[model samples]
Target: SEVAHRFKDLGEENFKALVLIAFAQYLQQCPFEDHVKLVNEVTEFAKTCVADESAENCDKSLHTLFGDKLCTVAADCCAKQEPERNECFLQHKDDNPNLPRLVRPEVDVMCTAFHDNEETFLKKYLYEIARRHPYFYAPELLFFAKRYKAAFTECCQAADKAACLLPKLDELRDEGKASSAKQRLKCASLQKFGERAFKAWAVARLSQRFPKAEFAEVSKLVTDLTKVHTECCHGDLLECADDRADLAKYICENQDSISSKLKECCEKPLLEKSHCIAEVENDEMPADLPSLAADFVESKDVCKNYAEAKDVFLGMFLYEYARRHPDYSVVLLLRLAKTYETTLEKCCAAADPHECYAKVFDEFKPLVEEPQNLIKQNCELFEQLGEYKFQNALLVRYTKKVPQVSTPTLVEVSRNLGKVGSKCCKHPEAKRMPCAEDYLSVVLNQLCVLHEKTPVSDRVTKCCTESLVNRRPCFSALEVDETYVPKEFNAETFTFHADICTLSEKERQIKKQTALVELVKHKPKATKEQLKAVMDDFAAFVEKCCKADDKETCFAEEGKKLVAASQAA
Candidate 1:
């Protein structure tokens, strides 16, 4: 294990040179450009060492580029000379296993910090991201950062901050998970297809996208890119990131031969560079490329072919279709491929396979296309309306259906329903509906928990008593309770504590949410704008008191002022 875990010998001289390279990566907030410069300097130093084995001038040679502290530390870490010193520095490189891992603050806390100070919040957010995923895919990380920043900015401007920000942040989190799943699948493809076949497909895909490029040139690009997948897919995240940067550098260096947009992408630093390149649209596929046969799996050999090499055969089909149609996103193309696979499984077993196979696309057409667009639109709404408003909308719908239930109970159910959207709305369209329904049913059953003990509404009772399959539908179709009026908000029921300013962040958010819920319950007839203003006013008080010289005095003064204004409203 020790032998296998040790760094590979890169010649005696180069090994010592790389200690700084490895150490430089550990520096906080150092620009990518600095790292590149260090590499160039180290490369030159390595060359000098190659010519002279006893060369001990890195103090003057390499240390000139970095600060004294780093060079001093590096010097002490490798106090010995030549062969012995190389081993010393190598051990030091891997010895620091106690570095603190980045832990992100809760969404509410994050946004609070963001609102308090955008510049510091952004720096901290990016800092946490970089530290936590040191070897993560940089482009995807940057994309997530951009979306998170946007979510904070957009949601902060909303009439309902909690409703707008929570689910949007959750969606961004889910997207990061989705990207991981994608990377894993890509790695699996690399493993399943083997290096040769994997690179062949990559070359083909790149060739189709960049038809103007020479075959060998594209092949070389694919080789380096594929090597990245090989390392990243197998769990060495650090190597994956390094490989990505190396690939980016290669592309930038060869930008003249590649597309013009990629050259522009290369000009940006680090994260932006990767993000820019990732957004570059694929060029038009060469007309000469063979199109996927509409009846690719029509034959009985379908099952046999699938059984022999399921991923490879299915992957090839998807690849063929994807290259042919540059219009479809990866998410959509994967859904189409999944539909084709599912269709094959059913038709291949039918006694008269021809009929089943013939209308396969037709049968799944609505299942895939229309519903997907709707789910896409639904997610779009989920983000735009924010989770709180979305939940309130559900509460309004459900309340009209079963109005005899207490507002608190129904509000609880509505929040749970909103949670279902938070959990599943960001999923790919094909999986989104099932995920929604499954979680929605679980949340809906909470209403049934109050069925026998406190049966407030006969219709709700009847719906709860129905079979699990029919319960949701029955609840859905129930008539509006025209006689029921929701309980009114009573301001006297709520109180603000001075300790709210001093609690743990999680507890602070919990208190904040509780206050919002009470405001929602008490002022049921209040306009969203009014409720928001009251909540914001309360928040402004907390913000002021939390930082004041005397917390109790500030809370007392600001709290009464806000409450009077809210009561007047």
Candidate 2:
């Protein structure tokens, strides 16, 4: 017993649970009285695994989380004299709904008001949560995975010496490196070490980060953290802290839960359970970091200086993107399918303003080689309205500049530019437009004219700094995608960076009139309110020179005369 239990780490209860479950799993003993008694003992042990609060929230009986008949059936089956008692528990497991299904989300809701150790607490109880609600594959489960995965990837490795070693030890055992396990540790010796490991981890952070934090906060931290890891580890029926894929089995096993989530996603503006299920089944590495990126930026170590800034920015950018597109799960899916930390760090983080980056290293045509792929794996909806993928990226970047355009209109712009994107896609211009907002304006403006098949507005786009002294601000007009010219507009010239402010009264009036025409014609999404305001001047122009030889020019032109007339009126 001393040699087998020589490990200094696991406490009394942890070792007991570990030994019994393993033995219980191993034995298919004859139907002796002791065999049935052992089954009863295991039944009570599983019941005590849940929390008072958690049990109360759902099953007042405290027998099981689903509020049903006790595992009496499964336990009795385990007692039968047969070669199949092992199969019996699993086959009859569902006969008792009380096995483990969560009815409340107290801890999930707990994330909003807390961060530091609240994260710790949530993670601890998650195993039990999974067992009770084993297959939620729902929002809360997704949220739980998001928080801890980052912690494991980034924070776990750098953990306080003692706390980290055990989970690391957990990993070593899981990998069948038991040949490495010392007399002090062995196969089942350390299964429950996460309890000690986590408390040390959470309390360390709580004290270090918030030495003066309140009791309510600290107590909540302890309770939450304790229940989470203990229950999860206790319920670590699969018993994996190191092997995420093993846990993925736990998540994927709930067919109804996964199916339920599928229904939920399809009902929303976004849904992809087929994709979600595939990753778990394949034991694939993380592709969906729905919340990790957000959590990345908030971590104390991230974006601290130059080396970290790129990761910081990358996470910040993707996080906001998901938020901006709350209605779409495709955004999250695209991220998971396309980019990863290593890819971003090596390619995207390496800088020097190349238009678009590409790579053809040996055999792997890795993701960073395709920036569009990184951002486009699942944005079919982005193209649904006829917008180019690049255009979708641009809209995400310059959302502030185009407040006047609705989401639908932006989709229109993307659609309108599909021809443009296809044509100039090879050019450096496609990867990096110097002034992208203006480029979009140009696309919108010219499409309007081409559709009408008439140059209703000035064909010549004057430079924002054209040589007019008493001119409207140099930015009254939209900036065109100056680098790419339409075949039809190939003949028309767009002047750039010139001062065209100097002009006669009539010339200036024509410019004003042209501005109004361009605004109405270029962007089809012109709101009536904006056009009406432009029209008040149009009415005044009618009173002044509406009947002039060039009827269109008479609208807001005569810029000087119209303003003079209005001020005089």
Candidate 3:
């Protein structure tokens, strides 16, 4: 009755017999071209039989002839475009209307059978094929042997099922002996095809559970598959042809799409729940929906979100959270730091610190040399920070240390110096003259201003007083008294007195007035001659002072020596 009904309704048992017979015929004829159509016809018939429940019962007969796993090999063969296999399977289906449904439970049995006796197939049969037809099927047979060895690790638990299918898989591998090297190469190609199909199925399954998961995960899987293809499959497959540049470009282009979904599903919800802790009713918490919701939000948020900002926020949140929950790890902070680096670079270039503290160092780097603006803007902050503010202050100090000519323009220098001075003055340990050169420059300018403001008598008196205080043997007593005496006599009396004081005093005034005239008169003279003349007069004055033992003479001699030394040769 089972056979009769199976034949009457769907005719799968008869189809399996006809498929087997037709394969035998094609093998005799060596007709490769007709196998694909035959395979397709058998596939269609199996689909029809699957539609008929009674025809599925005839599967018992198929198990007897092609073993219990017959439909799996048939289904796989039927899925191909080989006309010979298709025609043979269709003929077998027509002849015997008894074939089993190829379902998960049956496949599990077949997989177990292949797993149990993989070693026998590898050692006896595969080794023979590899040894005899080393050129043709060696590569694929080797791969299959290795793959079975790996699968045996898990599939060994069920020996009978593995025994049943291991022979057939090896048989199929051996059958490719007549195929050319290129055709035999296709057998190995199927491994990657199988892996890609499995990965695709996995991605589809994962998507069902994680509908809002970033496509980057999917993209990464595909990328990894591509690598597997190139590494394992001899580089013929298209699935493993992905370039990292292309992957990166795709990620960049679709970043918004990925980030938006991640934020909506993961980050934003967690943020809302995490913020809802204070809600209470009558001193007793409302039923635990909010807490449950918060937990769910946080758990989901931890895994799903991958946005740069979200990553940073999560990192910072986790660091503090980990401090409270000491059992938790702070490794995520490093990840957050890395994600923020690019954003930090942007902010650093723009010199904006409003977004994050991680960017403070980078943003402050270039501004350190901008002493004027540094003082104007950040001086207050530097003051508030105290010693901890060394980085910024060091930059400013380094800016001062660079040679002024190599430094920024004069306006910038002045502004920078002013800023440093201002800030330093406010600083508790700031020096009166923070830098000697800058201080000296300011002092020289102040002296020029004082000289411009004072009367001639006052200027002379100031110069004499400065000279006396400095205690250098430069100004004579008469010159000091003359400078302080307020020019009481007329210009001629002053001249006569100055002239009468000493030949040296009279000659000093005359020489000061006539230095340019001497240079013009001695233009034709060598520089050495001109220098010698000046030095000789200075030496004579010094000798005269030493002989006469006079204070005015000594002062004049030292003054002439000091001033003449500075004159250009």
Candidate 4:
């Protein structure tokens, strides 16, 4: 009767898929000897449950294998459909909190356990790390597992086990930290810098990863992939995983035309396919293709095409620019999109649209000037001044250009640019310029996004909206007004809550940055010192409230008090 109810609740496809997904995950964690028997038993149990769910034996087997708690979670998870259901089952499979804490075992301890029984200890090791971060998909986890195996295998034979193995643990921890940070940066870039920034990142990533693929084909693929990040980056882990899986299937559908290495990667399971594709050797670009920009440049209907769909038309320009000038920075590609669109808009409205459009490429020259100079100067400053003083330089530069903006806004922007210099300037000479420009553009785009919230000045607006050709000159030429007073705060109540605690550190930083931006907007008249105080106070509130027992109560009471204090300032 219990089995029949579960079968009814889950439906056929879901019931079978859940069982397979759960069993596969479970068997990976299980001890080596138990795996064969578990697999046989699970295979029979699934068939029997579907065939005659009323059977008492099937019901008992379910509870015995997965335990009653997991079985219960599985039944509740069935209420959702694919993707979400898949996410649900995978997330809850090892949901027990009573499980032992995942500590990095000592070198001597690990050598003893691994040598005592190699396969079982590795299985237990994998299970421990896997459960600790359940959201990590199969490919990433298995890669880490292989690293673990290699470390132990080599270290066990060494005369000084601690010297060999202990250092490897630090390397492994750093590796994991980098991976998580990269993923977070991807989503944070999307949320803060907008779709174009994310698109540029995707193009750079895909082009580098699959060099042999046709640029035109890869361009089209990137458009769809960019759309996935819209939902994926917004905190839906299951949706992200499902969307990635779908992209993998689409890539493999034309396996014959792709590189042999890529074809091999496609044949792997869904979880491993993406990771494999990323690691494969770069191949030669497809030959004899026409100039990617020729169609858009030569066409008479270009304006008509652009008028109907801005993103698509701009997308064509980006594809062409990126493929032809493979050496260009991602920031340069972004500048091209801005230049191309602005050129077309004016040309399309001119008396001779085609003739006006003919001179469009001429405008691209100046866009390159500032990007290169900025890159050189930023890197030079980073080399000479180092991070601490370099950050101050960036703040001074931004403050000079946008004097009307609140100090907090510029402070956050400079902090971001400082990080860019710290990261990208450290790359080899060949990669340094491109890496710095690409990430600096993402940080710079923050200023453009903020302009939408409140117009800082007429020059700032023109710099953001006009052809990027004169953007630097436009900002440079602007004179600060001698008499200007910001309006007082009269907006809604400033509230903080436990919800902010739920965000990842990157997301939380974004949230805090945005809140500070809003505070500046509402309380524009507040002195730079006053604004800094408010920012510090809000940050302290979050730090304390998040640790309190009744976090919600702490937020509401403290939040209301901050509103009154902020007003008096």
Best by TM-score: 4
1 or 2: which has the higher lDDT? 1
Native RMSD of candidate 1 (Å) = 15.0
Error of 3 at 59 (Å): 57
Clashes of each: 2, 32, 49, 0
Query: What TM-score goes with each of the models?
Result: 0.42, 0.19, 0.14, 0.52
How well is each residue in 268-314 modelled by candidate 1, as lDDT tens digits? 66767866775576664556864344337455566667768776666
Q: Point out where model 1 deviates above 4 Å.
A: 1-129, 138-226, 229-276, 285-309, 324-327, 349-354, 370-569
lDDT of 3 by residue, 85-149 (tens): 44334333211112232122354644455567643333433323322332232223333445455
**What digit string (tens of lDDT, one per residue) describes model 4 on residues 493-568?**
3577788898777666656655555555454344556666766777778888888886687877877777778677
For candidate 2, what is the lDDT? 0.33
- Candidates in order have lDDT scores of 0.57, 0.33, 0.34, 0.60
Give the poorly placed runs of model 2, Cα more than 4 Å off: 1-39, 42-234, 237-306, 309-314, 330-343, 346-569
Of the pair 2 and 4, which is ahead by lDDT?
A: 4
The CA root-mean-square deviation of candidate 3, after full C-alpha superposition on the true structure, stands at 39.8
Give, for candidate 2, the lowest lDDT window spanning 10 residues.
178-187
Rank candidates by TM-score, best first. 4, 1, 2, 3
* CA error at residue 470 for candidate 3, angstroms: 99
Q: Which ranges in model 3 have alpha carbons more than 4 Å from their true place? A: 1-212, 235-569
Best by the lDDT measure: 4
